[PDB]
């Protein structure tokens, strides 16, 4: 998407891994707020909005 027109996905009922994301060198930056990236794999969420 263009930044004026950003595309949102709701992640529905499922099991995840975030370490395949936060350990990947594919990303030039990987910030987090209110959570540590390395700690995501211990948690669960009511939804995720991407």
């Amino acid at each position: 998407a263009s930044v004026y027109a950003w595309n949102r996905k709701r992640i529905s009922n499922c099991v995840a891994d975030y370490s395949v994301l936060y350990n990947s060198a594919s990303f030039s930056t990987f910030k987090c707020y209110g959570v540590s990236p390395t700690k995501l794999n211990d948690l669960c969420f009511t939804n995720v909005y991407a």
Binding site: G34, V35, S36, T38, K39, D42, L43
Partner: peptide
């Protein structure tokens, strides 16, 4: 303690 690393 369940959301953050020691440094935060």
């Amino acid at each position: 303690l369940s959301r953050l690393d020691k440094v935060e």
